[PDB]
Amino acid sequence: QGGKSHAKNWGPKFGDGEIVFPGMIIMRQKQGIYSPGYNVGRGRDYTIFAKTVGYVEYSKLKTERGKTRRYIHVVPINDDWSPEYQKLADELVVRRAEVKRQILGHHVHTEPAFHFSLPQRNGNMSWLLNSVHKFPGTTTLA
RNA sequence: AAUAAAUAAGUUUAAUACCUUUUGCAGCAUGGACCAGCGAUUAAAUGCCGGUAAUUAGCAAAGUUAAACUAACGAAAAAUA
RNA sequence: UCUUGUGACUUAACGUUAGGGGCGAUAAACCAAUCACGCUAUGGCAUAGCUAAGUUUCUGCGAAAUAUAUUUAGGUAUAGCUUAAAAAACUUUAUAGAUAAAA
RNA sequence: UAAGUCAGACGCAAAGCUACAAGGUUUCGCGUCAAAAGGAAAAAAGUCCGCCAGCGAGGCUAAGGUACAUAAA
RNA sequence: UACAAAACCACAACAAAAGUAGUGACUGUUUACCAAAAACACAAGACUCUGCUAACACUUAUAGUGGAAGUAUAGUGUCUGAUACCUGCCCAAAGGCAAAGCAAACGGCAGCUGUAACUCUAACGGCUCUAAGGUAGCAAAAUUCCAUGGCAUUUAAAUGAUGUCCCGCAUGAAUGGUAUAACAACUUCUUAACUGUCUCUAUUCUGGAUUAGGCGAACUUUAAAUGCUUGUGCAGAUGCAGGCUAGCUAACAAGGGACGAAGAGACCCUAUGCAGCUUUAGGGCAGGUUAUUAUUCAAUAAACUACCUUUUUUCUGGGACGGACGCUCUUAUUAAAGAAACAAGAGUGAGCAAUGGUUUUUACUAAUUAUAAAAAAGAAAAGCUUAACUGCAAUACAAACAAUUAAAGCAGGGGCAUUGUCGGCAAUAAUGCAUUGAAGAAAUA
RNA sequence: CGUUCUUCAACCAACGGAAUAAAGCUACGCUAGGGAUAACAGGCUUAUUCGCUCACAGAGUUUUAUCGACGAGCGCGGUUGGCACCUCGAUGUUGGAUCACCGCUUCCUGUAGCUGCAAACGGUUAUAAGGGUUAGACUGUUCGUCUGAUAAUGCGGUACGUGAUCUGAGUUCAAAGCGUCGUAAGACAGUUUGGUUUCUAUCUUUGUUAGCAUAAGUAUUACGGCGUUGUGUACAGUACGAAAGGAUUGUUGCACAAUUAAC
RNA sequence: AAAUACAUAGCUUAGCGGCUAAAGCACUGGUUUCAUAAGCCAGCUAUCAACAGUUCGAGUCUGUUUGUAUUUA
RNA sequence: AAUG
């Protein structure tokens, strides 16, 4: 009788000259209307995301067969295309997290603090429990 | 809705009670004839968040209960000799 | 005014059947002034997302009637709303050859 | 504020449903009422001007008015 | 028995019909306080059960009592309801009961098509299906939607009454069919007579009202000093705006308005609703019967009867009836996003062991529910493969929350290449929390 | 026996799914609430209905005498509808009896034109609301059919006027019968028989009367109320007309009927 | 106007995805009989309401336009 | 072995 499907927000998220950080989504589209340019990626559903720190750019290209192609680019901070820019981006990522924690305040906790320790698997932290809970380092050999 | 603001005291102008309930009530929606008396977030235990103090608390009386605290990276060199 | 008026009749005294019931030529009739479960005490200040009511004064601030979910639609929860000239940023899109200093 | 609210209404301007009807109904942009006294149009919730701490027989204006009712050519 | 009847007979008192149709035989009985009837009972008919410590009922029953101190021509239960003439077929399926049978137990009892001189009709044929296919009788009914059916009688005039025609929406034979003398404070129509019922009212008697003395209530009351008319307004004004209205207070009389008084609307819808009743809605066994087993009035129960307890959504241009409830695509509300109606137009609750991953070649550039995706990309062809992995993850989209969506990167073991890609499929749908249950492995006790 | 990891299944499609499971009747009904929500009446709207104008096609056949259309516009609030704004601590249902006020879209009684108007009987348009608008059979009816007369037997609004004035036949409680549907309780929106109608008038409106308030009598004018009706017949078998048929006119004459006023 | 079924040679009646077809009456020809009926033998009807879709392929599955019942207002 |  009635009914409606859940809405999908297709469209751009940033304009020309806006600053982005790695992992941020720039475009949500149902078809490949826009193609990935430099310093960007594309998901299996045609989601375009940034892969470095920089500013968003838009450009148009005319192909060999007379079709129009549209790209999305991310430009480095000072137009630095050298391979040394990657380490600068890594430092900026660490700094950005510190800025956010300072603004939010101490009472917005960003790590858990339980009365027990989480198990370790394959050298990383795991959220799955072991069959038995034991204190670390409270037993000797044999 | 019987009053109000004024006046040379003759009068002139302004002006559809209250409560409850509603998008909206002078309401042709609800309740009250009037007076006096009576008539409705109170007490205990526990928890959370502010305020005001003590500077651990209770017993006991040189010794015991309750609470609270208890490792995180030992990183500074400021000598006009 | 009308029906019956020796009969399946009417009347008086006393007695019998009691509510998870009795009685009934059945009308759900009657059982102490109106019974599809009598009266009284107790459980008991039953329960009511419904209607009604809520008692002195002054000062300051000040909404909503939408979204989602619901044995949910005149109820309730979450979000929303109301209380509690700083820093940072540059955005409504497209392009040229203009100088003349020295015997 | 771990509060109240989850019955809304109409004007101008658009669209769906109705019959390019309803003071109809469903969304949407602004405003007003709701919770807003005062002035103009006859009475005047939603239109036009404009937001009331108190008193006074001072003055200038808005919307709207300027032969009588009724202040001002 | 009942009815008609010219006429005849009466001191004063007492006085009130007949016929037609429908329904019940009759006299009786009933909703104390709106229904007296066609409803119930009734004499009578039939069916079934019961061998006597009878069946059955009361009761905790191991008692005791009624039945009955009766004994199948008797007693219990059920449906028909004097009397006269009658009372046809079916026990399949789903139940109940019983001696594998029972309908006067509870119930049922069709459709299509061709055919006789002109026509019409079908005496007469053909086919399908079922346990059986409604027989006689009666029939515009207390039963008929078309409807005030057609014809005749009745009247000056007939939605009336009686008679008659008839597959009758949806008649019908013991939930009986058709008739029937008598009887009826029952319903219907007609005749005689009579009359203030009426044309059309008038006069009068008795009592009240009305006048005077005495005695002395009740409903109701926010406050009142309470005009008309049109306009306005929670949409019908004594009280607001315009046009009008000028002696004062009552008595007797009428009843337009004060949305007049009395009873927190019964109708309708809405509830954390309540109650009674019904059943092949769920669960139980706690009386009897029945079945099995055991001791010299007992134990267990997927049965029948009785009893106890529980459930029987919401949305909705009021409710019921109908329809609908998850998830995708598209249309209008322009060219950011978002946006509702029981608005509109289409899909889906999967498929693929390759239609997945990856290399090479080229006279190819399609298709999907729908769609201007895509050329260093795809499709097809050829080869090798299982990444349709193990353990983690910065940062974002969205969003009340739950969950849902995209993803660089790190370690391990792999595939095809030979340093690139692979954590399923062009993309946008193919789904389900927690609980409970189950399987493989591992660690404890 | 318990815990963790890797996984799956059933009812959840009322698809945020849980009180394990799980249908109905009430006209014998009961309580708490709503005009937040229906049935009668009012309100808004005017699709539909109705009326008028333009249109003059087509029938009549010289005439737009008369009838009458496609299509468009405007108006009315009386037909069938839509909405849910007022009332559920109550705004009495259909028809009639009794007594009324208003509109004109005129049935009769009037005035003035046209005509396919000789007369008579008619047709149509404009204007006019003072008076009048009948007695009976059937039906609960509104309506409808019919009978004998009549100058004629008009329509609509007023809570589809009118129950604190009357009526209760229909519809709409509890009883009962028949048919159809349901296993049943029961239902009909089908039919049949029966079934309680309260009120002493405070305010306003209206008809009469008394007392009180400026002495009594006669009183032009003004103001208010009422409303001057209808049929037959004679003047005439004359006008008109081949015949048949058969008038107009009137401060007319006469008889009668209704209404009003008294006696 | 809603809701559940059905439209198959001349007439009843199989069939509901592999080609577009079964059975009985009727019709035609032959045989039997003096002749007509019954009885026997062989044949015949492109055998699938109408339109648009799905699919390699539809009487068969999905919609629309017509006709017929059945239930409801 | 129904009929003319």
Ligand SMILES: [K+]
């Ligand atoms: K007083």
Ligand SMILES: [K+]
């Ligand atoms: K008797």
Ligand SMILES: [K+]
């Ligand atoms: K019986």
Ligand SMILES: [K+]
């Ligand atoms: K009787």
Ligand SMILES: [K+]
């Ligand atoms: K009155």
Ligand SMILES: [K+]
């Ligand atoms: K409505």
Ligand SMILES: [K+]
């Ligand atoms: K649900």
Ligand SMILES: [K+]
């Ligand atoms: K009401």
Ligand SMILES: [K+]
């Ligand atoms: K006239």
Ligand SMILES: [Mg+2]
């Ligand atoms: Mg659907």
Ligand SMILES: [Mg+2]
């Ligand atoms: Mg209201």
Ligand SMILES: [Mg+2]
């Ligand atoms: Mg009161």
Ligand SMILES: [Mg+2]
């Ligand atoms: Mg009864």
Ligand SMILES: [Mg+2]
């Ligand atoms: Mg403020």
Ligand SMILES: [Mg+2]
């Ligand atoms: Mg639920």
Ligand SMILES: [Mg+2]
């Ligand atoms: Mg709500």
